[PDB]
Amino acid sequence: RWRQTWSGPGTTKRFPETVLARCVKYTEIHPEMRHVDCQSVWDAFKGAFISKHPCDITEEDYQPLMKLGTQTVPCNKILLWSRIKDLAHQFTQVQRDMFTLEDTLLGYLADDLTWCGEFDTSKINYQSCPDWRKDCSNNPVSVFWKTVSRRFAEAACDVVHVMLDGSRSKIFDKDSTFGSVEVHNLQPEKVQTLEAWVIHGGREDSRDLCQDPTIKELESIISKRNIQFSCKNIYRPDKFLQCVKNPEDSSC
Numbered sequence: 001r002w003r004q005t006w007s008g009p010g011t012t013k014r015f016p017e018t019v020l021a022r023c024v025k026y027t028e029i030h031p032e033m034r035h036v037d038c039q040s041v042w043d044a045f046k047g048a049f050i051s052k053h054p055c056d057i058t059e060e061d062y063q064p065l066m067k068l069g070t071q072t073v074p075c076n077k078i079l080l081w082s083r084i085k086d087l088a089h090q091f092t093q094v095q096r097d098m099f100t101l102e103d104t105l106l107g108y109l110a111d112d113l114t115w116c117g118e119f120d121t122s123k124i125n126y127q128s129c130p131d132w133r134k135d136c137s138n139n140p141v142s143v144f145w146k147t148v149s150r151r152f153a154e155a156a157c158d159v160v161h162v163m164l165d166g167s168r169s170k171i172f173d174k175d176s177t178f179g180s181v182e183v184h185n186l187q188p189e190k191v192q193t194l195e196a197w198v199i200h201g202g203r204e205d206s207r208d209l210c211q212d213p214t215i216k217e218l219e220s221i222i223s224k225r226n227i228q229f230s231c232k233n234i235y236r237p238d239k240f241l242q243c244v245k246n247p248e249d250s251s252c
């Protein structure tokens with residue numbers, strides 16, 4: 001207790017209750033997911049990581065959960081993001097025809113949660129969980145997000161949008177989950193264009209961040225998949241959301 005097994009936070013307080021309540025709310029709000037048995041979903045979720053070493057999790061562990069959480073999403077209305085989760089979600093709460101991963105069942109369940117089990121008992125570990133960098137990368141959380149992100153990116157078609165954080169050192173970071181998983185699972189047969197929306201953090205920062213070296217890197221990487229590239233600066237995120245809420249406004 002003065003010395004925990006892992007470096008990361010333990011399983012989120014009330015994790016079982018929260019996942020279960022999130023599943024109920026989601027399936028109540030979204031009519032297409034009425035066939036979902038939320039107890040069977042929790043049980044599949046559990047079976048992925050309970051009684052398993054939290055540094056030996058595989059995508060296979062999550063396949064029963066992936067099967068139960070299978071969902072058809074409008075393929076042409078997908079919004080990916082990297083390092084700017086809050087604005088992405090604020091956007092999709094207003095622009096209801098667009099979807100982030102966290103607007104799907106599986107993403108909604110797990111959003112902002114941490115969890116892990118123990119190899120030597122059947123208990124959930126509420127004390128600590130492996131950190132991706134400091135402990136091990138094949139942990140329950142990281143493997144979950146890799147698995148579901150890959151599927152989501154594979155489902156995308158037509159014009160796919162991505163929100164990127166313009167305030168960060170690497171606006172596009174090839175070592176991020178977006179750069180290492182999502183980008184390399186956009187299907188060349190289906191995706192026409194990836195359009196980046198670069199969100200500015202500064203008020204007086206009116207650089208064209210679509211000419212940033214890392215954006216050119218993204219453009220170049222994507223061209224190999226025969227995917228076109230487009231980029232837009234969002235100079236004023238607060239004005240952006242205002243315009244999204246009130247699009248018939250003249251100034252928008």
Ligand SMILES: *[C@H]1O[C@H](COP(=O)(O)S)[C@@H](O)[C@@H]1F
Nearest residue numbers: 081082083145149176177178
């Ligand atoms: C796939 O990647 C994005 C965010 O990951 P990151 O670039 O901030 S590390 C999520 O939509 C999902 F995890």
